[model samples]
Target: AVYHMTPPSGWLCNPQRPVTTHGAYQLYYLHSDQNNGPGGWDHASTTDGVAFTHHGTVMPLRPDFPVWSGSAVVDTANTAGFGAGAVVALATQPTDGVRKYQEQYLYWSTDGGFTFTALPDPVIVNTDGRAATTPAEIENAEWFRDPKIHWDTARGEWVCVIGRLRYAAFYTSPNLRDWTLRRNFDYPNHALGGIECPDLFEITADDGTRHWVLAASMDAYGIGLPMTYAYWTGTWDGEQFHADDLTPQWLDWGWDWYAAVTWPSIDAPETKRLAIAWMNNWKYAARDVPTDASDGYNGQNSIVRELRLARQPGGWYTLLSTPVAALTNYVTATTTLPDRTVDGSAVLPWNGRAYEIELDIAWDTATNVGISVGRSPDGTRHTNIGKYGADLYVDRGPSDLAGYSLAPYSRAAAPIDPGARSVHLRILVDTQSVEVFVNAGHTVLSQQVHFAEGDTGISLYTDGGPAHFTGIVVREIGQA
Candidate 1:
């Protein structure tokens, strides 16, 4: 993958939200030497969102303390006594000895986040008094991990949101060591499993109103949900979060995009927030995907997306996301197609492994119209990206991943506007994954697809009747 961020070696999972330091964005991820080992924190930095420079593992996994997902921030005020501009991170790790409970530990960096040292003790401890003898008991005991921290300007303190079972536990700290539990926010109406990687931040809408956005990655395997990121636009009154609506909106209606984190650069506008996610599902993460070992790595990150808040018809707010403008710098070639109406299928002459497709489709009299990429020469294998009824869907059933049946990787769908006669799509295709942004990111669907060799075809088709496609442009992404 020329654009996506992959581990230098071994395995990777959740990515921490990047923090700006010394004119660069420093990003961290959970890394391990083996695919199923205790992971540590790996460091990477990027000036532009497209190209990244890996700085290797900053916090190596120890036998006594193996790091998990968490958040990092640059302590600009010397709040934690690290330094004026040291990077302070609150990371989750299993407790020592029996390793039954998960706790948050403090790690600080003095040299621009390239390295970090532990504070020798856990700042927050799990006090659940339950038996955790087995793996299931240990996992379900307290369900406390992935503490996301942010500097609360309203309260002039640091705020942290930890995933606690079905709730997002809020905490406040004056310095970084001591924390006071504020409250736990939960939505009972939604069928969400254990929550992980919770984030709370303020975002400005286009109408110049500021709203707090709370997002979390849900482990909704049992509920049959996407197990992706869910977010809510609400108000944070220094203590508790008040959501405008009880029902949470999904960030991406796809299985592969999970554990997403967002960050707005220090110099960027208040309305410009960027997000990235792990492009793999937990159910099939342990299994060997096509990109695994082929390049000595097993994980990849999605393209960074610029996010904005948009007001809907019901006075509610939802996130609008699009690929960052920096990605266009790496477009080596472009292909423009003339306006055409397709009844069955129209195969394009362009073929490439990594590219992007932007087009507008008028439904006309057709019930379904979309495109298929990574198609084999015989049309027996290809990943289908289409709009069916009122939902946008990606079907990877025809892809060539035969033996890996750990989870359902066939298809995923997201609801879109049914009344609109036309829809715009921006699809980013890589060697092993596909990310589709619908109607200027009102909805998104991202998934991983493994195609056989020489399966680099692109075709457009319509089901019920002819559909018109206009302003079709395909760009081949070059190496960063």
Candidate 2:
């Protein structure tokens, strides 16, 4: 947990969109004491992305209605009637005592987002021609939850997107209290396991072209796709999003990154945005793992990422993600390896629990070239990350300790260009996870790992033949 954010105790999930106030990024997450219980909103703030200051639980779970996932915004215009400079948040909770239907409730904070008070009633209720208030009607009721809200600069109003099973329902509000349904955006080819944690925002490309991105966390049951966040590049005309293509592109090709959300950077909103996600998968999340009992916490979050848009060959736009620059503030040491060519395995001199490694590899006669981290002294456990053919992959099966056979703890791969002669890698190795950013964040693979105590060896290997490794550098990270 050197650079990652984890709860003080209990379980944590799904980060809410952060609001910048007084030079700090104020964020919240769903937290619960018991793994199976309903969750409440917990608060924290960070000036640098690497270090956070906990503010405890801002909105605790209610007796009958527990708060779930949602987003927050800073009311700079006093449009929500909570006064200017107040923090306004919308969260999902069961609308009825039977817990049969879900709706969006409003909560406001006047003390710089340190504490909040909820409105007596929900702002967005279930009235979209669906049954409500009965267990038998659960199947017919709208699966409405996880509301993500943002201010539409073009329309000069608040826009919200709520997850509704197969569709993302769009709504508009003049003051953030009253809402009107506008559209139900859907893609027929989306993942079959439904949608959750929808986010809509405008992004600018490096070439000065702007585009709108609509992203959602999708779950696929039998499909081979990972349960991760996917996005579409398009245009937003104040009423609806018109995607350039029906097929979506994933933000991350990893098993543990989910419920992803992004917000504009404080100083560079036009060209930069910040993103974060929960670093755990739902497949084995419910099981009682060793970390929960030994460490007193059950969940952790990925390192904050900086988002930028890049244009492809066909003039379409895609997202590029890298670790935020603020993380460099905590780099305690740096070790640079001289450029060399390797035909076999070579163990690097650096060994640590938390560090960032940057390297460039040019393929020659080798078919596979990559690194193995979190290696035990006895060579019994390690996580292998490398490029095989045109695919970038991470294999965590050797180090996974969740004890669940059904979980996809094996190798996870994403496609890259096989014809390209070289590939760049930026890897972040934490105590519990490994995040690989390939080719300057064009492809990403994130996975959680469990290694034996004091296992900190790092080695590089190439199969079949030799590869050239250049400009290799490792930076040991520390708490800010």
Candidate 3:
């Protein structure tokens, strides 16, 4: 579903351990060899961030150790006594029938994440939750599994967030081994479903104000049951985090992009936060796309992006998305369009199925600016991206693309800064995915798109009035 990376063989899902160490990205995921059984942690490393060097399966799945979802942190301070700059991986150990409870355990790697050894004890366990005697409840502790751990520099401790039913359980520990249950954070109401892969981090806005960002994958069902990854920006005062509003803000405005992990910085010169996610929704993951076992792969990963706090005109700090700095290193070819008014129609000088397209233009009194991609020969079938004022939209309704029980083919829109300044967009299109990052990631919309064979062309047009497409570049993406 992403042009940035693909699963080597089998099914890759639930991105984890996206830690930046010594100017390199260390990413891990839950991967199964045959797409039908349980798998273990698969590792990949990259310096350029866009193209990854496959490290194969560094960790194998045990008989009962299904190896679900979790996070990895670089212990630069050796707080857990593992050692300086140790890779501490925190994951959930669901009861394999050999154990009596679902527990959170720790694994440490001393040789730069090459191998890991489990600590003597689990960090926490669910021995006292809603006990399960029946088969259904036996595996369901309110669907609690994903554990996200990070270092809280402000509090001088390590903080971990775990999904517990509809609420996110917060815990704290001075060391990585022992833990203390702090509190459980419930949403404003109970309309939305359960949570998964809760992530917490700190970001400084453009105005130099620092705030905490908390995000989780919501169990949105049936064409908008609160779908997508939602985030909140507020304060984390040592013990717990408090959001500005009870209504959660969405991290992405599209269907896919779930269980995203914010990159944990390991060393200097990598202070900026970056993230990646599994780009398939739980709603139709089993029924959709081209993962038919004959393709050798079943899932994909989103582009690695740097996250920042964009100061909105409303004066509140909102999350902004930008392509990681390492991406520009992999541009195979580039085509830049001349600055001119685009009104009637103009085909771009470049075209590719797997590529990156960036457009920076100032709206010049046009009712709506349109950019078309994956265009067919007749131009009647193509993916259209419309820009009107502060709202940016991608419409796949006109495309001949079809999938298994797609929610709907309505236009997906994301709010962007509609100020007087020129608007910027970074659109990444692979064969089966389209990720739109507006205003340099201030608002993002990522969706899976399957283009018919030979559908690969691009053009730009405007309605009503002339619009100045000041800059447009298309770059082919190649494997590193």
TM-score of each: 0.95, 0.95, 0.86
Local accuracy of candidate 1 as per-residue lDDT tens digits, 115-231: 888888888877652466677666655578899998878779988899876778888898999999887797884467667888889888888888898889876556655788988
Global lDDT scores for all candidate models: 0.84, 0.84, 0.74
**Candidate 2 local lDDT, 128-237, one digit each (tens):** 42544475356435578899997888889998988876778899999999999887787877554567899889888988998888889887635766688888888767
Clashing pairs in 2: none
Error of 3 at 181 (Å): 1.0
The whole-model C-alpha lDDT of candidate 1 against the native structure comes to 0.84
Which TM-score value belongs to model 3?
A: 0.86
lDDT at 147 for candidate 1? 94
Each candidate structure's count of clashing pairs:
0, 0, 1
Deviation (Å) of 275 in candidate 3: 1.1
Where is model 2 more than 4 Å wrong at Cα?
A: 128-137, 140-142, 402-407
Supply the TM-score for candidate 2.
Answer: 0.95
lDDT of 3: 0.74
- Higher-lDDT candidate of 2 and 3: 2
Error of 2 at 282 (Å): 0.7
